[PDB]
Amino acid sequence: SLLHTFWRLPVAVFFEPHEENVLRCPERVLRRLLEDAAVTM
Amino acid sequence: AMEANIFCTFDHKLSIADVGKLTKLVAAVVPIPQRLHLIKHYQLGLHQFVDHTRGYVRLRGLLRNMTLTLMRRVEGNQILLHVPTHGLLYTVLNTGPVTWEKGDALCVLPPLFHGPLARENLLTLGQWELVLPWIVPMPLALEINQRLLIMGLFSLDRSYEEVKAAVQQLQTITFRDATFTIPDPVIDQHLLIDMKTACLSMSMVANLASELTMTYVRKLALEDSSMLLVKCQELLMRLDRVSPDDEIARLSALFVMLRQLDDLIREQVVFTVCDVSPDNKSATCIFKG
Amino acid sequence: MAAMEANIFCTFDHKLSIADVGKLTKLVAAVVPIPQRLHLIKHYQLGLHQFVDHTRGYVRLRGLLRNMTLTLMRRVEGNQILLHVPTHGLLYTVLNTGPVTWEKGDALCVLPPLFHGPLARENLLTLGQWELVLPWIVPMPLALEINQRLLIMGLFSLDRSYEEVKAAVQQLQTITFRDATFTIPDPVIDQHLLIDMKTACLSMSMVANLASELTMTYVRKLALEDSSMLLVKCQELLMRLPARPQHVSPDDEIARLSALFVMLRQLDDLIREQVVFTVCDVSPDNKSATCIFK
């Protein structure tokens, strides 16, 4: 499930809007979204 | 209308042939240990610093702080010397083995050719032999420094034929119409003391910088406000794919071995060629100190 | 606009007594910094009391002093001080300020004063709660080891207890250069010191990466056969752990040595501030000298 990243050590970000935003939704939002995907089928 | 000069005298007698030899070196550079006014001939050049045991590196270290001067005129009374100053042009002889061009950054070097030679037979008195430092373009000086340092680094493995082949590769140096060679610093299968301590400090700072780095970047990583730091530690982690007083002593040791290497890792330009005369005996260059 | 004024007149607007001008007459041929250059300046900007902070960051005062303009004092008179901004590479007399014995040939640096405040007990033109703080002129190795011990204190500040730093400052503050003791005031953390530590760790990583095997093994190759006191004293700070070299090459390793010299230069520039005075002849009472390169 978990990805295999090429760069071993992780890196911080200045969070520019001109930088592409980085997946900021935490796991409770993903729980809500899996509930939405289950209920919309 | 006179100018501020230096009156150098000679306690030995001087022949007319030696005066005619000395008047060939009109625009020649001469180092002087302290800019006095009435100096004897014993402190002209580097014959005060010719030593059997010492080597090239201490000559370069002394030449970094010598007071360089130019000659003006020679007389049966006395000899005139001129101290240069920054931002003025002067004529200067090309006593070095390499011809120059316009705009080349020039700097002063200790003489590689040493002792008795067909070119070092200048103004040679009884106990005295006037020697002159070389005026070389800057990248050739950097090449000579690098090649002499790495020839000093191969001193402890001359038994291997491959190392002798690498030394014979390093000992020959080409340039623009210049294929001169340098003497090897190893004599009697040993290295001279100043070159030995220079390359020892080099090896020591390399060893200490390879040692202490991971703990310091690990300490710096817990205040990570710079994304250069994590790739800095990732470099060292991909390369491998302690008491606090020991830490303090190793830091001070690393910085003192760096401080003893300060004269070799950098140098300053002394002259740059405003223009060059034909026949390339001399050139008009602006002093830069 | 107007050009650069070689001569700068300063004016004390506040009333001077005779003792202050008598103390100022001893300040001839002394170096003072100025933030800006005008022909007729006020006395507040002259000196260094305008930049004494409550942070008391010695690296901050050092970096601020590096960006000022140095001048020499001349022609002290009634409520007027001539300042000569000196030009490049000319001869200039100078009078020492800090209690450092001077010699010949050694280049000099400008530095903020150690133990600044009333503890040094300087009666320098105290008026309108404004002091005349003179920048020290020290030789090369004193300033070199001051910047070195500041960087070593910075590198030791990380991940250490406060009492470990308190046990380190009693070791590192004592400098006894040229038979005269000196102390390091308030070694604290600063963001500029963080910048120096970051470039120091980056340069150390780079020279650790670019070090070849022969540079890494020369110390062991010399310690296996040779024997001296300096070899012993440099061996004990290293760690514990006839063979042919695996692969050598002249042309690769000269490029390695050039890049390694570049990295050692980028490490050297931190502790070496600048040369600003090159002494030719001192006065025999060690109270004045002559210099070039201004």
C245:B162 CB<8 A? yes
**Mutant choice from B34, B83, B208 vs C, greatest count of C C-beta within 10 A:** B208
Local structure of A23: helix, strand or coil:
coil
- CA–CA dist B177, B22 (Å, integer): 28
Find residues 1-41 of chain A whose CB sits inside 8 Å of chain B. Answer: 7-13
Q: β-strand B6-8 against B38-39: which pairing, if any?
A: parallel
**Mutant choice from A11, A13, A19 vs B, greatest count of B C-beta within 10 A:** A11
Find residues 106-165 of chain B whose CB sits inside 8 Å of chain C. Answer: 142-143, 146-147, 149-150, 153-154, 156-157, 159-160, 162-163
B244:C164 CB<8 A? yes
- Backbone φ and ψ for C269, nearest 5 degrees, come out as -65, -15
C202:B150 CB<8 A? no
Alpha helices in C111-249 (DSSP H): 140-157, 162-172, 191-210, 213-223, 229-235
What is the maximal distance between C-alpha atoms in chain A? Answer: 39
Using alpha carbons only, give the angle C209, C211, C214 rounded to the nearest 5 degrees.
145
A9:B224 CB<8 A? no
Chains A and B touch (3+ CB pairs under 8 A): yes
Which value in Å is the resolution of this experimental model?
A: 4.0
Chains A and C touch (3+ CB pairs under 8 A): no
**Which DSSP letter does residue C29 get?**
T
The method recorded for this entry reads cryo-EM
Which two structure tokens, joined as six digits, stand for C265? Answer: 């230069």
Closest residue on chain A to B224 (Cα) = A12
Taking residue B67's Cβ as centre, other Cβ atoms within 10 Å add up to 19
Q: β-strand B79-82 against B134-137: which pairing, if any?
A: unpaired
**Closest Cα partner for C201 from B280, B272, B194, B226?**
B226
Query: Which residue pairs, CB below 8 angstroms and at least 24 apart, start in B218-221?
Result: B219/C158, B219/C159, B220/C158, B220/C197, B220/C198, B220/C201
Across C21-37, b (16+ Cβ under 10 Å) vs e yields eebbeebbbbbbbbeee
End-to-end CA distance of chain A: 23
CA distance C135 to chain B (A): 24
C141: Cα within 13 Å, side-chain hemisphere:
14
A partners (3+ CB pairs within 8 A) are B
**Closest Cα partner for B36 from B8, B10, B61, B78?**
B8
